[model samples]
Every structure is written in C-alpha cells, then in structure tokens.
Target: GVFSYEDEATSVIPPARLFKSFVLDADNLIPKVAPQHFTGAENLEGNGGPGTIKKITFAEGSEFKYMKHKVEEIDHANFKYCYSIIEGGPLGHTLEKISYEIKMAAAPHGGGSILKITSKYHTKGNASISEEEIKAGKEKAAGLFKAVEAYLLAHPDTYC
Candidate 1:
C-alpha cells in the first residue's frame, strides 16, 4: 500500500510564469536569481528535462543541507512536472523513495495560478509513516514556493 500526500497553494502569478521560474530552467535561474535559500544546483545528467538528476544545495537557515532529485516528466504546455527523490533527502530511514508531482492551473482571477503537489511515499517496511517527517519538507516546499511567488510578483518582467 502507498500513502499519497497532496498539498496545494495559490499564486497570483500565472502558471507559465511560475513554471518558468520553478521549471526546468530553475537549474540555471536559482543560482543567478535566488541565492538566499539555495546556493547552486549540480547537474548530474542531461539538461533539466526528463531523466536528468540535479543536486540542490541549500544555504543557511534551511532544513536539510542538500537533496537530489530526478526529473521524470515535464510539460511546458500544461505547466506540470513530476520528479522522484533519489538520495540525500529527508527520507531518514523509513522510505525507499518519494515521488512528487506538481501542477499549475489558471484561476478566474488575474493570471493567478492554483498550484497543487502530490507526494507518494514508498515505505521501507510495512505500514509506518509520519507526516511529521515529511511535513517538515512540506512546510519548506509550501513556504519556499512563497519565496518564488514573492520574487515573481515583485519583479514581473521575467523570461518565458
């Protein structure tokens, strides 16, 4: 059995805007634009597309020193992507891996985006899990997205 965890957030920014900032391009954008939270990302494979693996190293005042993920799917047209945790994550000792999927939809408001994420936790043993363990990351991702939202809103002129 797999436990699916879903988290959602709303952004005044559009899907394409957030997609550009948080999408495959972030491999290049984060180091240049956003440095307070993350320092840099190391590319282990091809570009920031499917089958590519990137190692994200965070700065101070953040949970988990570093983490790695493999991009599994990406759709610029639809503004959705899916990735899987490989190693050096918040997995601790209970999970084999965690697959994450994110989607962005346009709201009735002005270019606002409804962002939603789903996490599938693969356990190491039978049925033993804690939202506490993953919730920390949940909090980080939910809050960190705000960082992107704030950054994007303050500066509207961004490349697509």
Candidate 2:
C-alpha cells in the first residue's frame, strides 16, 4: 500500500516568482540558497523539463550520496509541478520512490500565495512506513521551504 500526505507553505513572494525560483530553478538555486542542506545539483539526462533526470547531492555531513529526481510534469500556466524521487538516501530499503505534486496559487485578497505539496510514498514490497518517518519528512520539507522563502524575501528582485 501507498501513503499520501499534503502540506502547504505560504509566502508573499507571489506565485510565479516562487514557482520559478523554488520549482523551475530548484536544481540550480537550492544549493546556492540552502547550502547547509544541499551541496549541488545537475541534470543527468533529458532536457531540463519533463522526463529529465536530475541528481542532487546532500551536504557532506548529511546522509546519502545523492538523490535522483525525475521531472514528471511542469505546467507553468497553472503553476503546477510534479516530480518523483526515484533514487536517494531517503529511500532506504523500504521505500520504492516518493511522488510529489506541487501546486501554487494566489491567496485570498492577493495576500501572497500558497504552495501546496502532496507527497505519496510508495513502499517496497510489503514494507510499511512509520508515522514518525512521515512527520520527519514533512518537517524537513517545510524547513526547506522556509529557508527558500527567507532567501526570496531578502532578495526581492530575484526570480521576478
């Protein structure tokens, strides 16, 4: 069986800007903005669009050698993005892959935007994921978004 969860992060950085910086240019911008967590990223195959295979390496002291993410979809007009972590340290021996769907939309009264993320965990064989594991993963993603949001707020003109 597969497990799914949803989470969101709100920012006053606007939808397009946030989408471009955090989603479109993530492979190049994440390491620069959050070097403590990410060390580097590169495209291993395909264009920088759908079907592309990108490898992202975590910090030296952190776990895992690298993560391989396959871009599934990118709808700029609707501010929707989808991707799958096909390989990485986080997979461990229980998870096959983690699928993610990110949707960005303007908040009510134009009060910035909300970035909603849906995560699906596909287990390996008959293995199961623990609640603690899911909670940890959610916290990690939220922290990453907060770091990126702080960076964007500091440099308002960026990704505009």
Candidate 3:
C-alpha cells in the first residue's frame, strides 16, 4: 500500500510570504537558502508552471546525486503547490516515485503561517514501503524546509 504524511509546522513567516519564497521563486530561492542540500534546480520545460519539468542537483555533501520532478500544480492565491518525483530519489530500487502536496495558510491567531507537507511514497511492484524509508525521506524533505524557515526567521527582512 502507498503511504503519506501530513507534517505540520507553525512558521514565523506568513502564508503569502512563505509561499512566495518556496513556490513562486523556489527554483531560485531553495538552493540559495540551503545550498547544503541542493546546488540548483533547472527548468527543463515550461517557465515555472504546471506541466513544467524540473531537475534538482544535489549538493556535494548529499547522499543522492540528482532528481527530476514535474510540476503538477501551483497556486499562490490558495497557497498550494504540488509536484512529483519522476527521477532520482529512491526510484532506483524501492520507490516508483513520490508525490508531494504543499500548502501554507494564515494562522488562526498570529500573523505567522501554517506549513503542511504531504509526502506520498509509491513503492514499486507490490512492495510496501517501510517506516525507515519514510523516515529517511521525511528527514531529507523536512530538514530543507526548516532550514529555509530558519533563514527567513533569522533575517525577517527578505521575502517581503
């Protein structure tokens, strides 16, 4: 069976601001924010929209080398974006691909934001994914995000 997670976090940055940084300008800001995890993301197809193909080049210290994704959806007004891994990742042996749903919304009381990442792992054949696999992938995914959030929080001037 396929597995997914809804990991939530309270971000000091607002929805629109965080969305702008990670979605609208992600290809540029992601690597810039956390060069330790990624070197750069290239646009292989369209100009940063749904139906666009993207390539991610990992940093020198990373375990993996590269990965590719196709942008399935993007929306700033609703603060939601979705993409899927078509290459690299654990596609070599275990996984067929991973679908990600990212959403940010304005928090209830504070001016901060609610960041939720839904990472769905689809294993190959009839193989079901194990907890270790999910944990590793979540570490890879969440670490990069909190890094970006930290950078934004530490500065508080950019992404405005």
Candidate 4:
C-alpha cells in the first residue's frame, strides 16, 4: 500500500489568504475547474476544526453521490487540517481507510506562503496502484493549484 503523496507549492499571497484559498474555502473549487465531477460540498457543522464533518455530493461524472469525513485534527497555529473518510464513499472500501492533511506556512517573504499537502491512503489489499491513476491525480492537483494561482493573481486588489 504505497501510502502517501507529499507535494508542496509556494505562491505569493498573505498567510491568511493562502490558507483560505487552499484549505478553508476548498469547496468553491470543483465548480470552478471540475464542475462535472462534483455538484457541491457543504459544511454541515463545525468551523473547519477537529470533529468537523462535511457532506460532499458528486455530480453525474463522479463515482459516488455523497460521502462524509470526520475531521481528525485541526491545528490553527500550523494552519493544517486532517480528515478521515467515515462513510458514503468508495474510499472507505478499497482504501481500507484514508486521510489527508493540508498545511499552509508563512514563507520567508512577508506576503507569501508554502502550501504542503500530504495525502495518506491505506490500501485494502496491497493492490498496486496503476501508473495512470497516479499520473492523473498529480495532474489534477497541479491544475487545481494553477487555477488558484490565477484567481489570486487576478484578485490582487483583494489580497496582496
């Protein structure tokens, strides 16, 4: 069960804005780039903290119609959130289980940040993940980051 992806990307944005774009306000993303993949995701309760759970639904193209995750950890000081899939998704099955931790840290520059995202998956049967799947996921993540960068750049007036 090759279980992890440690990817980091740095961009010039105030610490607060960076965190919002990459973590706190992530649901606003699918509609922007992959609208066909997800209809929407809403936070039913909790303030993006530990124990927070979100009801995420998918559109026609998505595999599952809905799913939930239990926020396992939220560190405001470190700007990181970790969540585990609890129910309503294939992730709970083939995955055996899984979690993701997204973190944002202040860069050396006054108005910059480094986003570090770590995704950990526990494979149910030690099934070898296909190279194509890995490549696709990486491409998707890269595309998402680039889209966010474009959004921030165009909204310079709002957050610098």
Candidate 5:
C-alpha cells in the first residue's frame, strides 16, 4: 500500500513557459537558474528519448541521490510528463518508490496555469511520518517554485 502526497500553486507563467522550465535541459536552462541545486544531468544513450536516464547529483550532497528513470509517459500536447525512479539510489534507499507528475492546465478568466505536483514516496520500515515533515516539504518546494518563476519572468530568454 502507498500513500499519495500533493502540492499545488498557481503561477503567473503560462503552460508552455512552465513546461520548458520543468523539462530537463542543462547547458543553459536549469543550471543557470539554480546551479547549486543540481550537480549535472546527462542523457544515458539513445535518441534522447524517454528511458534516457540522466545522473543528477545535487550540491546538497547525499541527502538525495539521482535515480535514473525513463520518461514513463509524456504528452507535449497536454503539457504533462511522468517518470519513474527505476534506479533507486539515495532517496530510493529509504524510499520504496518515487514518481513526480507536473500538471499544467490553462486556468479560466485571466487565464494562467495551475501547477499541480503529486509525489508518491514510501520510507523504509514502519516509522510514522509526521504532518510537520510533510508540511515542511511543501513549503520548501513552494519556495523553489516561487524563485524559479520569478527568475524566468524577469529574465525571459536568459537561460544560461
């Protein structure tokens, strides 16, 4: 059995804009904005398609390690991508399984986008996870989203 966790936030950024940012592109996009956040991400092989695993080591150190994954599903037209952690390393050591889905849909009215992130994570053993820990994770992720949104909105074309 697995418990699902979710966090959502409305961004002034549009779907297409958010999509590009979320995509795993190195050289000039991700590292430029948050260099300290990621060590490096390299496509394993093939035509750069899904299952093309990338090794990402964060400056944050072993707290979390990258698990190579294949793009389990991708819908450019729908602005959504899903991946699975098949390589289980750092987080996976304790985490039974992990998956992240970023959903961006057009909002009515002025029309922005709603970013919904759903994650499935199960720690080893039978430790009771606290609400405070979950709340903290949401807050931390929210802060990162805000920073990225602000940077992209400001630079707009400045990726590297």
Candidate 6:
C-alpha cells in the first residue's frame, strides 16, 4: 500500500534566499554544511532543474551508500521544488520510489517564510511500509533542514 505524509515548517529566513541555496546551489552547499550526513551531491543529467538526475552519496556511517533523485518540477518564481527518488539505497527491497514536493512562500508576519512539504511513498507490489521506517526518514530529513537553516542563519551574507 502507498503511504503519504504532509508537514509544514516556518523559517526565519526568506523564501528567495532559502530557495536559491537549497534548490539552486544544493550540490555545493549540502556537502559543505553537513558532510557527516551527505558526502557528495552531483547532477548526473540535465542542468539541475526538471528532468535532471542528482546522485547523492551518504556518509561512511550512513545506512545506505547513495541515492539517485530525479528532479520532477521547479518553479523559480513560486519557490516550489519537487523531486523523486528513483533508485539506490533508500529503496531497499520493497520501496519502489518516494516523491517529495516542497513549497515555500513569504510568511504573513514578513521577514520569513513558510514551507509546506508533501511526501508519497510507492511500495513494490503489495509491500507495506512501517511507521518506524517513515519516522526514521522524517527525522533525517528534519535534521538536514535544520543543519541548512542554521548555516544560513549563521552566515547572512551567503546565498544572498
């Protein structure tokens, strides 16, 4: 059965800056900011936009060796990014794919932004996903976002 999840997070950083750093320059920023979790990120095809394949290698201690993510959609002006994991580590044996979409917009309070995230997991055949497994992935994803947010907050001049 397929499982889906949705969540939101508020950031003190603006949408434009976050979008540029996270979506545009992720290959350079991710490994630098959190090398312990992500060892490398590179585009295997296209120009880092729709139809591009991004291969990400995990740290030595990570559970998986690497993950292959394909860029599905990107709206620069709207600050929306969508991608799907097509192959490699995260899939294990049962999961076929996992798709994620994140949309960022200026906060009503101003000077910040709100991020809405949606994720869908597609299983192989009749395989079912467990809550614990989903939770683990969510935790890691949260950690990644926190690391990036902290880095951006610390260096205001960067990604501006």
- What ranking emerges by lDDT with the best candidate at the front? 6, 2, 3, 1, 4, 5
Best candidate, lDDT:
6
Deviation (Å) of 110 in candidate 5: 3.6
Stretches of candidate 5 above 4 Å error? 24-28, 45-48, 60-69, 108-111, 124-144, 158-160
Candidate 1: stretches off by over 4 Å: 28-34, 59-64, 89-92
Error of 3 at 85 (Å): 0.6
TM-score per candidate, chains pooled:
0.83, 0.87, 0.86, 0.72, 0.72, 0.89
Local distance difference test, each candidate: 0.74, 0.78, 0.77, 0.66, 0.61, 0.79
Clashes of 2: 0
Candidate that beats the other on TM-score, 1 or 2, i.e. the better one? 2
True-vs-predicted CA distance for residue 38, candidate 4, Å: 3.9
Give the per-residue Cα lDDT of candidate 1 at 67: 76
Per-residue CA lDDT of model 6 for 113-140, tens digit only, reads 8777888888888888888878866876
Q: What is the C-alpha RMSD of each candidate to the true structure, in Å?
A: 2.6, 2.0, 2.2, 3.4, 3.6, 2.0
Off by over 4 Å in 4: 29-37, 58-67, 108-110, 136-140, 155-160
Cα error, candidate 1, residue 98 (Å): 0.9
lDDT by residue (tens digit), candidate 1, 1-160? 4677997788876777766666656666655555776777788876778888988787667654777878888888778888877865546456777788888877768567888888887777685778686786587577667777666667767654
Q: For each candidate, how many residue pairs have backbone atoms clashing (under 3 Å)? A: 0, 0, 0, 0, 1, 0
lDDT of 4 by residue, 22-56 (tens): 45666665455445656767777687667777776
- Residues 1-160 of candidate 3: C-alpha lDDT, one tens digit per residue: 5777778877777777777776667777657677877888888977787888888788566565888888899986777889888777567567887888889877887687888888888887889788887787788667767787777767767745
lDDT of 3 at 116: 80
